[PDB]
RNA sequence: UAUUAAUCUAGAGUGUGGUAGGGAGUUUUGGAAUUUCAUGUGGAGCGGUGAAAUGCGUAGAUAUAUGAAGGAACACCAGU
């Protein structure tokens, strides 16, 4: 029921989730590898975040909206399947902001599994 | 060479004049990020791994938006 906002694509390097939300808060509908079916180390690979996006794109546009604002999060390995998974939607994606969490030096990292 | 009586400035210092620094201590200040809590949207997983399982989750988690509190360390600059 509304034209623009934003969909935020968090990319974990174990999982992906892609929540599409209004211009402003208030996420309308959100969807992740995990509530695909999708489990075990399988959710962590680029087909299954293209997958992912492709859901939440069609659910979203039967709801009618046309201009996107893309927030691309995390580091993971399918940060761009999803985003071309998109594109095939036919969204009109208006920017490419990203938005990882970057700290300035601050709080100690864990330690390096070895 | 050592001792003593003295002279000199080149050794080493002092002053004047230029001058580069994350040199140190004391007292204040700032923003991201993590965590917790508060308020909305939301609806089934999240998390983790070589693969999983403890664990967290319909008491509404992960996520998203705003705010508050608090501690620690000071991205880029940053380097033949
Ligand atoms: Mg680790
Ligand atoms: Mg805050």
Redesign the pocket.
Known sequence: NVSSG?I?V?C??????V?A??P???????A??????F??????TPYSAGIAADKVAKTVKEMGMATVKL?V?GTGRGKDTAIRSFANAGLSITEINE?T????????PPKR?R
């Not at 974990?12 to 989730?17: C, H, M, V």
């Not at 489990?39 to 962590?44: P, V, Y």
């Not at 969490?101 to 100690?108: F, L, R």
Request: net charge positive; glycine share 14%.
């Open positions: 934003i935020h968090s974990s390097p174990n999982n992906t989730i929540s939300s209004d402003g808060g208030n996420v309308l509908c959100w992740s590898s995990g509530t695909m079916g489990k075990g180390s399988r959710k962590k927030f999060k938005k969490p970057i700290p300035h030096n601050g709080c100690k599994p």
